[PDB]
Amino acid sequence: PHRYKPGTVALREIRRFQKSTELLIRKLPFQRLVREIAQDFKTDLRFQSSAIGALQESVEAYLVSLFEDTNLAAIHAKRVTIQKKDIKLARRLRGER
């Protein structure tokens, strides 16, 4: 009957993923996504293996950079929880439209 308080194991796994540095997205669905967004412009496209890993590193880094800013926006909004206006406020203040 041992139940944890909500958010403690969140902070603990936050600490392990701050220790960790591996890729967090599945590779083969990401390959499916880049092929299905790439077929719109010229069909029969070949893909090198290193380019997809570079793309995955790029989207993970952009996720981290945007998510830190929306975390700061939600902390500034006197809340613990993120929302849609935090996201478009971060995109507005970064200048990404």
Binding site: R15, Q18, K19, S20, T21, E22, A54, E57, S58, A61, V64, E68
Partner: peptide, 9 residues
């Protein structure tokens, strides 16, 4: 951006 570099805790 450094690949597999990580973020500061």
């Amino acid at each position: 951006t450094i690949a597999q570099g990580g973020v500061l805790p």
